[PDB]
Design a protein around this ligand. Structure first.
Ligand SMILES: Nc1ncnc2c1ncn2[C@@H]1O[C@H](COP(=O)(O)OP(=O)(O)NP(=O)(O)O)[C@@H](O)[C@H]1O
Ligand SMILES: Nc1ncnc2c1ncn2[C@@H]1O[C@H](COP(=O)(O)OP(=O)(O)NP(=O)(O)O)[C@@H](O)[C@H]1O
Ligand SMILES: Nc1ncnc2c1ncn2[C@@H]1O[C@H](COP(=O)(O)OP(=O)(O)NP(=O)(O)O)[C@@H](O)[C@H]1O
Ligand SMILES: [Mg+2]
Ligand SMILES: [Mg+2]
Ligand SMILES: [Mg+2]
Lengths: 464, 458, 458
């Protein structure tokens, strides 16, 4: 269906069309000229009048014109981002379109050829069209950033993605900040409680939690000797059957307090006061608690800022080290690839702050691909995310962003986002998104499916 | 009532109108074209003339025209922010309006459908229209920022909001900087004196007050042991002098702890009270609880506010976890003069616990409200977590810029119109509203105590 | 073949052409005027119409014109970067081209005279033309940076280059991040496992790994003495367990050294091997030597890469000085995923020794090649020493800006055209070429192992 023709100046990646039919953001269009089949995306759309223009100042003339019938000339103009040339193996158009080049609505066959065949995980469909958008699953190892303003559909995206992946036999680990997935009717759900077991920690890790640097050789020595001593003693006592699980946490407190000098002691006691609600030597390792083909969800719902940081960083570290061990030995460690999802990531990943999660998020961002560990970060404040972590997020599902410095922030943290695409992020609607990265073959404007279930609310009763 | 028609260029979220009737900021308008019923908000309004334009240089010609009768053509133009499409489930208009599209005043029933039904707490009405605006009370868990220039109506907004919330059985904790609410005829008032009880402090908190932390590892050990020992003993028996002498007994390192302890008892003497009950017990449900900070210094104030904030957060946390301990009802903490506590170039204790509530509070039924006149003197991390924002008159663009970059739901053209706001007028964004609202805030029917003292005396 | 004529304004390094034939980026053109034979490069190409311009608003008029036959006038314009004057010893054109100066396609013989004769290593051919581009191999001592967005052909460039160099008897050391080259059918392949041998470490290097430096002066003394003593003894006898127990014997300060030592043997257990020979002996001349980093962690990787880099540099240095010791042949070290090692907000060991090679390497026959997709995540001091640069598709202007400010031989208009590059296409600058080259890089005829793992499993 011919909806318009090319007018004015055009380059190899941008053109202007005059339309005969109404068009809008997210509309895909084909421009055929020479041996070039140029796929274009409608971005900006404006309407005007040669008669009733900006400098029209007489209201009475307009009122008279209304008394008549369709006696006013109007136009519709639309900017077109030229994506590729379908004739030349989907490369860039090597020649601009001629003025007068007809622009037609893209066909289902063409769109499905691009957005449905190279993908496995369905995220939704194109706007207006009946074309399913499928994401390439292996490309998730190149990590994902889900960004949007408040209430635009970040968590709905996570829910849909987690479900479809699990249905494809994939494994996901969601850190649930508000308890949205933990109390939902999502399929393949695997509930995990936040526990910190020192028996599955390293002395390095235990030192970091106690805010003890490893280069602090005096304190670290005292701590490492003591920690190894007490853990070994407890394990030997469990094998000998001389420590009941009814009394295992308390014993660990007193044993460590005995094996320890004042700085280590101060930080250790503060560690047990600050993380009391989390420490559990009875709890199994997170690796055993994580199930394949399941949407594994860790509840952070009744934890504080510090406790959250400690739990997530531990599980991240455990996952990464385990996946490494599996690549090396093939007879131990996490046997299947996993995708870790950090909700409310701007709480953990700020640049002006140094949390434990940010360190291990960065590690996974640089290593995770080699060990089958994909990372997904979800936030509403892009500029509150570390540049180094955001820039390593190759794949990006960006819903509505209206704050301009946020747009620029995503642009400078992306290597595959164009400024003219970023300029239309404010015109996005709830559930609509611009999807970039290797998860798609070309930049995709998508309507994301509504999660068939029902996620728990995050807003509590403020009256009672 | 047709007030104008669409002229010139139009997008899916902005249009230009030529008006036949006088219009102003905050006027809502309907644009019906095709199958689109577009709600739009009038922002900038300009007036001009094709005859007496900017380049008119002859004063004698103008004077001659004045002797006649209406021989001068004038126009009124207004930019319209296209909010939504009421026909298509209140989404964005998917197509721009045609030039010549008539613009009518929005109907009361329509505006009331958007700004009254999804809300519970009344803040006031729209500008020009007779439509009450009701705010979603549960959305306050996403925290609130009341921002304005000096004398624009920040405390009046706090007064009205605290009242309506209390009337619905809601609870508010106001930290009163100037003593404005404490001796007022506000309804459901619950007066609270600023008290610091060491029996409800943590070794961390008590050590910080004595300025003993990492700078003194030895002293911290001595202090923590002594403090835990003495406090346990006092609680077990179940008083100020007793606590002093007992602490002085339990203690060159011990003298260093003792020195700072004696000093601590001097600097915060006007606040320390072991007879006083925990803040959790003094707070009443369905009441406007106000702590008077009127006669405290920076340090005592910071210590009290941070303590009560920490206690509130920890109690509500314990309640979600155990349900057999802690604060049983949700509360909204309100910090007046927040730029004093939340500056970035300073590190106060209140700032730590405000940020804490800003990140955790939603989960435990603790809402945070910050009231201030210096926006750029508010920490980015705390201001950006204030999802809801009641923004009154701001004329400094760098202030606008700062608020804009700390919001994820504020538009540039809306922030551009903050300077045309008047006393009592505000732009309201967040989940407390269904759509961005330009509102006339009701005048508090009570009487807040004045903030400016007599600078002469008698 | 005349493809256009010069119109409008022209300088000594830029001109505007009206074209009769379709043209594109990377097309070379000759401008003959006066005594000047000017080589020019087509960068930006635009199309327009005097009739159907930007302000065309009537769709019915356009539709009518379509019913006719070629009743619409169109134009094609292209900006041309004036490179040199082939008549005047390939210097800059000293005079602008006249308007109406005909522009012809450059001849194969001419292009081959510039891009084939001063080079040895073939990278590919020019865009549209059938002219092979050969790179100067000796100029690689001025180091190389391969920069592009994700999936543009960085590793394909590395693969091709490593092959041709090896075929000419050149030596390459690739640090393989994803294990792409290690199990591939690339020619002259020499597989190397990641090993750390303390017998080839310095007391400085071994101390840094144990995290013992200025933070522990006492421990550093104890450690250095022990390490030197034990290593000397082991070398004199001429093994892992023996080194462990001997070091454990030679050693509260000694326990502090011992604690960090035991931990060191745990964290780098998968790498430590005293049986392994020095990297200098494992490297073969005329081979593509590849170290597999596929199953290492950040720390082990950083330790291995930095160690091999340091060993290479020091050996080549000793060889220039003594000629009776050290690496006897020049080598080119290639760092894949360089933004992981060379970030500015981080201080890795590889970063120190990359910078070292970047400043010294030219003198000792050690070339450095960095491959990455995040340019602004590369240290300015290291990137600016990369004289030669193969820049493929970059669409982010701040990335362009960053590459531009780290180059001394990249022009703004060339950097402005980086976004129009395609997969396999590149802008090549440096002494490896005689003139800035827009090139189609050959597809590696072999097969690199994939980098993306199965994210589902079986
Ligand atoms: N694809 C979608 N289609 C339709 N409605 C959607 C879609 N995604 C989200 N919504 C709705 O939009 C609202 C926002 O929900 P949610 O998915 O949690 O967004 P959010 O970004 O996580 N909100 P927040 O986390 O507080 O910033 C809910 O009412 C959803 O039902
Ligand atoms: N909605 C309103 N309508 C009419 N008058 C109002 C309104 N709100 C406040 N006022 C009056 O305007 C003046 C401003 O005082 P106030 O309400 O305290 O603003 P304020 O911003 O809190 N002053 P300050 O805190 O010192 O910057 C007072 O006389 C109020 O009674
Ligand atoms: N000169 C070329 N001509 C044609 N295809 C090419 C060329 N160079 C690379 N490709 C192909 O394009 C794709 C890009 O892969 P690759 O060459 O590894 O780029 P890359 O930048 O190294 N990917 P990455 O390192 O993850 O950012 C692969 O399918 C290559 O086979
Ligand atoms: Mg969410
Ligand atoms: Mg006030
Ligand atoms: Mg590569």
């Amino acid at each position: 269906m011919i909806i318009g023709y090319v007018i004015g100046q055009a380059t190899t990646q941008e053109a202007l069309i005059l339309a005969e039919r109404p068009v809008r953001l997210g509309t895909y269009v084909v421009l055929e000229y020479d041996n070039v089949k140029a796929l274009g995306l409608i971005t900006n759309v404006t309407r005007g009048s040669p008669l009733l223009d900006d400098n029209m100042n007489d209201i009475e003339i307009v009122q008279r014109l209304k008394q008549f019938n369709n006696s006013i000339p109007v136009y519709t103009k639309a900017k077109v981002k030229l994506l590729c040339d379908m004739n030349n193996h989907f490369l860039m158009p090597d020649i601009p379109p001629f003025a007068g080049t007809p622009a037609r609505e893209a066909e289902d066959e063409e769109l499905k050829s691009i957005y449905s065949q190279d993908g496995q995980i369905r995220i939704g469909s194109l706007i207006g069209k009946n074309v399913e958008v499928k994401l390439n699953i292996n490309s998730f190892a190149r990590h994902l950033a889900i960004l949007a303003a408040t209430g635009s559909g970040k968590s709905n995206t996570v829910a849909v993605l987690s479900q479809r992946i699990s249905e494809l036999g994939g494994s996901v680990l969601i850190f649930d900040y508000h308890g949205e997935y933990y109390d939902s009717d999502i399929k393949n759900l695997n509930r995990i409680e936040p526990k910190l077991n020192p028996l599955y920690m390293t002395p390095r890790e235990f030192s970091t939690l106690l805010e003890i640097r490893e280069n602090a050789i005096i304190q670290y020595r005292i701590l490492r000797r003591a920690f190894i001593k007490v853990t070994n003693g407890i394990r030997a006592a469990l094998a000998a059957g001389q420590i009941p699980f009814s009394t295992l946490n308390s014993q660990f407190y007193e044993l460590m307090a005995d094996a320890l000098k004042d700085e280590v002691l101060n930080k250790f006691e503060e560690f047990m006061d600050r993380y009391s609600n989390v420490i559990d030597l009875t709890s199994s390792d997170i690796i055993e608690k994580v199930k394949r083909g399941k949407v594994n969800v860790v509840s952070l719902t009744q934890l504080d800022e510090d406790s959250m940081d400690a739990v997530v960083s531990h599980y991240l570290r455990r996952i990464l080290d385990s996946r490494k061990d599996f690549k090396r030995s093939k007879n131990s460690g996490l046997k299947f690839p996993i995708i870790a999802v950090i909700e409310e990531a701007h709480v953990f990943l700020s640049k002006n702050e140094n949390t434990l999660t940010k360190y291990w998020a960065s590690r996974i961002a640089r290593e995770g691909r080699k060990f089958g560990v994909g990372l997904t970060i979800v936030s509403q404040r892009p500029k509150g995310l570390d540049e180094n972590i955001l820039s390593q997020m190759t794949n990006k599902i960006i819903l509505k962003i209206i704050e301009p410095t946020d747009k620029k922030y995503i642009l400078e943290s992306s290597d595959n986002l164009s400024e003219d695409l970023a300029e239309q992020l404010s015109s996005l609607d709830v559930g609509e998104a611009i999807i970039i990265g290797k998860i798609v073959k070309l930049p995709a404007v998508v309507k994301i499916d509504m999660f068939e279930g029902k996620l728990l609310g995050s807003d509590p009763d403020m009256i009672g």
